[PDB]
Design a protein around this nucleic acid. Structure first.
Lengths: 348, 348
RNA sequence: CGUGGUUGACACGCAGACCUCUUACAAGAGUGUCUAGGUGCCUUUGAGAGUUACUCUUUGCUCUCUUCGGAAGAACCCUUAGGGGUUCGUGCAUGGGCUUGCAUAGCAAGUCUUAGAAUGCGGGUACCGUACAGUGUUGAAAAACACUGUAAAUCUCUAAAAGAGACCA
C-alpha cells in the first residue's frame, strides 16, 4: 500500500522518479533490489550497518533483495592485487559479517549472489548485454561514469576503468533488478543504466535509491575512506580500538553540518535502537535519552550535548551494535579463520 | 622441419621471432593457426584467395588452422546495424565461399569456429582472461590499437572500440593459438598480445605472420575499402563485373611501386597456378608463360609487357579462380538463397 | 535541357548519367541508350526529470505526464461496425498595421489572428504515372496481367554543443 512507499523511500535519501517507485510497488508484490560490493578487505562501517538497516527496512515491505557481491569487479578495481582467491575469501567474510550481525538470514528471503557464479551460470544472457551496453555508449560517457570505482582522480586512464561501468550497468538488467539501492557514487552507473534502458526501448526503467555518503571519522574527506584504516571504523575493530578511534574522531561543538559524529549517530544508531541515550553527570544535564535526530541536533546547538561526552555515548552504542559480530567470531571457528585471514592481508 | 619453416614463412610478409617459429615447428608437429573475420558486408577478393592459399599451404606443411567468425565483434563495429541474425547469414555465406574456393576442409585440419558457439561454450575461462588483459593494460595503449577497427584517433571513440581489441587479444590465447596470419591491420593486437605474454610471463609467445593487404584500385589507397565497391573485387562478382573492374583498374606503365595489378598477380595468381599465362598477339611477343614474379617484373620494367594485354589475362585468370564459387552458388538452392540475402543487405 | 513538343521521351544542338575504346581513374574519342515526376492533405500546446558537469545563460537530445491530440496517414483489434479502442508516425523562421524610435504606414519596443498556414523552406504522409528488383499466371520466344518494394534509403550509426564566471570560457 502507501506504507511500502513510506518506508522504502526512507532508505534512499535521494531518489528519481519516485512515482515510478509507487507504480512499481503497486504493480509488483515482490520487487527485487540489489547491492554491489567490492570486497576491499575489512568491511567499512557504512556498508556494514547502514546497508543492514536499509535492507531490513526494504524487507519489511517484502521487497526481495539480492546481495550482488562482486569479485571480478574487485579484480578490475585491483583491490588486494589481481588475485581472485583472496577476494573470494574476503567476500565470504562479508557474508559472514551479514549473518553474524543479523540482517535477514533467519527468513532466508535474501540472496547472496557471487558475481562469478551468476555470470558464468548465465553468460549467454549476461555478456551479450554487456556488449550491447558497450556499443550503445562511447568513451566519454564511460569515463564520466568513472567515479563509481573512485579511481578516476584525474589519474592515468585504464581499460579496466572502461570495462567496469558497462559491466555493472549490465547487472541491473541481468538480475531483473527493478530497484537500485546503492551509494551516491554508484548513481552515475545507475543513470547510465536508465539511459541504456531508454535506448533499448524497454519500459519499467529501474529506480535508483542513493543513500547518503557516510563521512570519514575526520574532516578532510566527505566520501568513504577505505584506504585509511584510521579515517574509517571497521567491524573487526575491538572495543578499545573503536573507543580510541571515536575519541580521536573529529567533532566540533556548535556545528550541525559536516560533523561525522552526528552523521554516524543519525545513519547508524538512531534507526537501529529507535532511540539514543546520552550519559552525563548531574551538573551537565544527567543521563538523557533521545528519540529524534531533530531534538539531538537542537540540544547540540544548545551546547548541553558536549562532544566530550557525546563521543563516549557513540562508542558505547556502536560497541553494542557490533558485539554480536565479535561474539559470533568467538563462537564460530570458521569465522575465526576468516578474521585471521582478512587481518593477515594488507590493503594494496 | 626446415621445409615447414620455409613454407610457413613464405606466406607472411612480416614474421617476428622466426627462430621461435622454427622451434615451435620442431616441437609441435601440428601448430594451431589463427585467423579471424568479422562477417561484415561482402567477401573481398583478399579474404577469399589469400586466406585460401594460406590455409592450403599451412595444411600441406602440416598445421591446424583455427578460423574465427566474429559475430559479436561485428555487432560492436556497427556492421549491418548489428543484427546477430544478419551477421549469422553472412557468416554461413562466407563459409560457403570458403568451401567453394578450395579450403582443404576434407583433411579435417580446418575448423570454422564461430565466436558465439565457442564463447558461450567456454565463458568461465575466456571472459576472465578478457578481464585480465583489461587490468594488465591501460587505456592509452588500447587507443593506440585503433588501426585495428579502421577508426583513426581523430574519429570519435566508442566502448566497442575498447572491448574489441581486448576480446580478440584474449582470443589469441583462448584458442590456444600459436600463429596469427592477419595482416598489417592486426599488427597492433599482435604486439599487444606479445607484450601481455611478457607481462603474464607466458612461455609460448604467439608468432606474428601478417599478410600484405592489397592496395586499393584507386590512387593512394593502400587497402581496399568496402564502403566503395568500385575499388575492390568481390568473390561472387560475375565475369562481366570482374572484367570491367580489372579494365577500370589502375596499372601505370613501367611502374611497380603502388601498382594494384602487380600485387594482385603476385599474391593471387602465381601462388595459385604456380604460373601466370598471358596470351598475346604476335605483334608484341606472342603468347608467353611466366613461372615466377621476377621475370614478370623484369618484363614490366623493360616495357615489353604492356598493361593493355596484362589486364585481360589477369581478368581471365581471376574468372578461372572464381568460377567454382559461382557454380556452387548456382547449383545449390540454399546457396542461391544465401547469396540473394547477402546482396539484399545494404552497405553500412 | 528546352523548342517543334504530353511528366518521361522524339526533329535539333547542348546538359548530365550509363556503355565501349585509346586502359591509369586522369585526358580524349566513339557510336549507342537513358534522364523523370505529378497530384491531394497535415504540420508552432505547454510544464517536468536526466543529459558539458563546477555552476549560470543559449540551447540540442532522448525523456513521462499533459494537450485546440507527434497530424494529414500506416499497423492491429473489436468488428451486424454506419464506428470505436491501442501502437507507430509531429516544422523552422518570418510576418501587417495600430502609440513610439521612424514624416502615422520598412526593422525594433505592447497585444494580435491556437498557425488567417498568412509569408517562404522543409518532414513524412495517401493516390497516379514511368522504369527497375522480385513472385505468380496467361504464356510458342516474345509479350501481357496482378502483387510486394525501390526512386525521395544511412553520422553524435556514439547527444551533447556554444558562451560567461568560478578551479578549468
Amino acid at each position: 500500500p502507501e506504507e511500502k512507499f513510506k518506508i522504502v523511500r526512507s532508505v534512499g535519501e535521494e531518489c528519481i522518479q519516485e512515482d515510478e517507485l509507487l507504480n512499481l510497488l503497486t504493480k509488483k508484490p515482490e520487487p527485487v533490489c540489489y547491492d554491489g560490493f567490492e570486497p576491499s578487505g575489512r568491511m567499512h562501517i557504512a556498508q556494514g550497518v547502514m546497508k543492514t538497516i536499509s535492507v531490513n527496512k526494504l524487507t519489511s515491505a517484502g521487497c526481495r533483495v539480492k546481495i550482488w557481491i562482486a569479485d571480478w569487479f574487485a579484480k578490475l578495481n585491483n583491490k588486494m592485487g589481481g588475485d581472485l582467491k583472496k577476494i573470494e575469501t574476503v567476500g565470504r567474510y562479508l557474508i559472514e559479517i551479514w549473518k553474524a550481525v543479523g540482517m535477514d538470514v533467519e527468513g532466508g528471503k535474501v540472496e547472496f549472489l557471487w558475481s562469478s557464479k551468476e555470470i558464468n551460470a548465465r553468460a549467454d544472457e549476461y555478456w551479450p548485454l554487456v556488449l550491447d551496453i558497450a556499443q550503445k555508449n562511447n568513451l566519454k560517457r564511460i569515463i564520466r561514469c568513472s567515479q563509481i570505482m573512485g579511481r578516476s582522480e584525474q589519474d592515468e586512464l585504464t581499460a579496466a576503468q572502461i570495462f567496469y561501468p558497462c559491466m555493472q550497468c549490465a547487472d541491473i538488467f541481468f538480475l531483473k533488478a527493478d530497484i537500485c539501492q546503492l551509494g551516491m557514487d554508484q548513481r552515475k552507473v545507475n543513470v547510465l543504466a536508465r539511459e541504456y534502458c531508454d535506448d533499448i526501448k524497454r519500459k519499467n526503467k529501474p529506480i535508483i535509491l542513493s543513500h547518503h555518503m557516510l563521512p570519514g571519522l575526520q574532516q578532510g574527506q566527505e566520501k568513504m575512506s577505505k584506504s585509511d584504516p584510521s579515517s574509517s571504523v571497521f567491524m573487526e575493530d575491538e572495543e578499545a580500538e573503536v573507543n580510541v578511534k571515536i575519541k580521536k574522531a573529529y567533532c566540533p561543538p556548535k556545528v550541525v553540518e559536516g560533523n561525522p559524529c552526528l552523521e554516524y549517530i543519525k545513519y547508524l544508531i538512531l534507526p537501529w535502537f529507535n532511540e539514543f541515550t546520552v550519559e552525563r553527570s548531574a551538573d551537565n544535564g544527567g543521563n538523557k535519552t533521545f528519540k529524534s535526530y531533530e531534538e539531538l541536533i537542537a540540544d547540540y546547538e544548545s551546547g548541553e550535548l558536549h562532544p566530550a561526552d557525546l563521543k563516549p555515548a557513540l562508542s558505547k552504542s556502536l560497541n553494542k551494535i557490533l558485539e554480536p559480530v565479535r561474539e559470533h567470531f568467538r563462537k564460530d571457528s570458521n569465522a575465526k579463520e576468516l578474521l585471521k585471514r582478512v587481518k593477515a592481508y594488507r590493503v594494496t
